[PDB]
Design a protein around this nucleic acid. Structure first.
Ligand code: CA
Ligand code: CA
Ligand code: NA
Lengths: 246, 243
DNA sequence: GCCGGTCGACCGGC
DNA sequence: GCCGGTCGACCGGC
């Protein structure tokens, strides 16, 4: 992680900070801005990242060509836009943001990538652990890590930003965590909720003590297990209760 | 539908005015200017139903005000929020709310939900309403035998950024309970949500509401079964080889 | 404490 | 044409 080193300054900086008001999504703008002010050469929005990468090789055109530019089936898988969209990319037609992009920020250096996703959170309101990342996307991710044996390329990390309403919104606190540093098997997969791993960064454990490859293998086990179970529970929850009306 | 008659009226004005989109607010206005009398935001309606009965208090009691195991289900905000309600502590908008707009007149409820559709970006049908919520609804409907109480209608609002702002391009209007059930797409991963564009929605169903519920339920059961099988093939067969 | 449903609308593979 | 996964968080029942 490139950002733990200065997490305290981030912490201190953000705590206090305020934003306008019509959820606290725009708090991420500040993270990016701050990160942009103390890690300039490592910080990109994910679209911003693709852009630079496609600008650096203006001759490489066409999506299959541009895809080769990643040098990593896995990173290829997490950061890249679609074929047509890769096809039609151009200096006059840059990538813009996209709800469904994996990361909110990339910190990259010496060909190591940190994918930062910023979970905002209204602590005054209830406490509903939010979507973290797709369980299925995380699974395909692991398969690739083994299949290409890319176990020392990137990490997925989270920066919670707590805030509350005050006349203006203001961050009262923040947490930070590392995905690949948590227990694969304790991860809560919410299937209906777009199959999203769900937790509060605050409460995420970091006691994991094995290799990255092991982690992938343990996650894939958890996933498959929960997948089998879910298939079964659907009969109970979704069929059984309604057979009677037929 | 208290909308269908004046659909022409609505449509006409909608096209050409500007403002994720949120013309949802726009339309409300029209319906308020022209129907201020049976036009509520869902939550607004609730303050009204609660303001108009200052005697009844606590939740157990306040739900009787719905006089409907079904509307209750679809409209209620739930024990604690309801218990804690009072004129100095009114409901606000809740992301979770079933409806965007509510037209109720002579004890018939029209549950309206607009769908904004960036018509320039993609043809990605949006979530229309959780299929499982709907199941529960149909079940209640059946049970409590209340087929002539409420409609769930949609009104699409297309748009593009042809200018400094967005801009409505055109609209559409369908009725969930006029569609063929067995035909509705249930995207399980997407919050178990029925997905469609209003413009493409079949409106050719000619049975009883009782029939519609019975058919929709069969469709749900069938589709819940295939999804469970889909999971094995999609999220189990392909990864077993890594363990 | 524990658990999992809902709104919102969004591409892109073949 | 046919399909369906993804980000965003967010509530209440026992
Ligand atoms: Ca985020
Ligand atoms: Ca809506
Ligand atoms: Na809906």
């Amino acid at each position: 992680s490139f950002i733990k080193p200065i997490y305290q300054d981030i912490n201190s900086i953000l705590i206090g900070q305020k934003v306008k008001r019509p959820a606290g999504e725009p708090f991420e703008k500040l993270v990016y801005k701050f990160l942009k002010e103390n890690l300039s050469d490592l910080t990109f929005k994910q679209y911003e990242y693709l852009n630079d990468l496609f600008m650096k090789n203006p001759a490489i055109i066409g999506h299959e060509a541009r895809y080769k530019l990643f040098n990593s089936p896995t990173l290829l898988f997490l950061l890249s836009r679609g074929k047509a969209a890769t096809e039609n990319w151009s200096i006059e037609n840059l990538f813009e943001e996209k709800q469904n992009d994996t990361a909110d920020i990339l910190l990259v250096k010496d060909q190591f990538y940190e994918l930062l996703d910023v979970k905002t959170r209204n602590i005054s309101k209830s406490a509903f652990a939010p979507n973290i990342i797709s369980a299925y996307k995380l699974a395909q991710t692991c398969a690739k890590m083994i299949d290409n044996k890319e176990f020392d390329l990137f990490d997925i990390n989270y920066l919670e930003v707590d805030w509350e309403l005050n006349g203006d919104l203001v961050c009262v606190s923040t947490s930070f965590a590392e995905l690949f540093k948590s227990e694969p098997s304790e991860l809560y997969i919410n299937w209906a909720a777009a199959m999203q791993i769900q937790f509060h960064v605050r409460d995420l454990d970091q006691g994991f003590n094995g290799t990255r490859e092991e982690w992938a293998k343990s996650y894939l086990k958890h996933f498959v297990t929960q997948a089998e179970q879910r298939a079964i529970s659907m009969i109970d929850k979704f069929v059984k209760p309604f057979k009677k009306y037929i």
